[model samples]
Target: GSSGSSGGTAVARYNFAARDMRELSLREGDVVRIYSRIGGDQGWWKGETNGRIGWFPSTYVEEEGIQSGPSSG
Candidate 1:
């Protein structure tokens, strides 16, 4: 079901590996406030950044307040 918000927020885990039209082309530490998702295990979540909203990969970000991958164990 492609309905309902993802119900949380996360931040970019690293500098972007590629650019996407429906996703925010992010920089390392980019913050995204997730409001919903497209459903399934598609890996993308819909969020807002710098007043713009789009779909970004869940792998590209982590839950807010969690450490990013580069230095995590």
Candidate 2:
């Protein structure tokens, strides 16, 4: 699918509890809407879920699909 947004969805591969108050708690197969992190460390990306915004390990989730404008072959 495509989007007119800055971020896309991802699926949690494994469960993760926030190490602090600013990180996300994730569960396997959980769908996360990453806020898209272009700042700070790439190890953890900002995402929204559980009615909150928090950081989640980049390796803990994987992009469900591509997010961008139309593409060519």
Name the best candidate (by lDDT): 2
Cα lDDT tens digits, model 1, 1-73, are 4243333877787877546566567667877776676663477877777667666787878886544557845
On the 0 to 100 scale, the lDDT of residue 24 in model 2 is 82
Candidate 1 lDDT score relative to the true structure: 0.69
Instruction: Name the TM-score of candidate 2.
Output: 0.70
Worst 10 residues of 1 by lDDT: 1-10
The segments of candidate 2 whose C-alpha lies over 4 angstroms from its true place after superposition are 1-7, 66-73
Cα lDDT of candidate 2 equals: 0.76
TM-scores for candidates 1 onward, in order:
0.63, 0.70
lDDT of 2 by residue, 1-72 (tens): 333343477788998878888778998887788677666676778877657787788788888775667888
| Model 1 / residue 9 / CA error / Å | 1.3
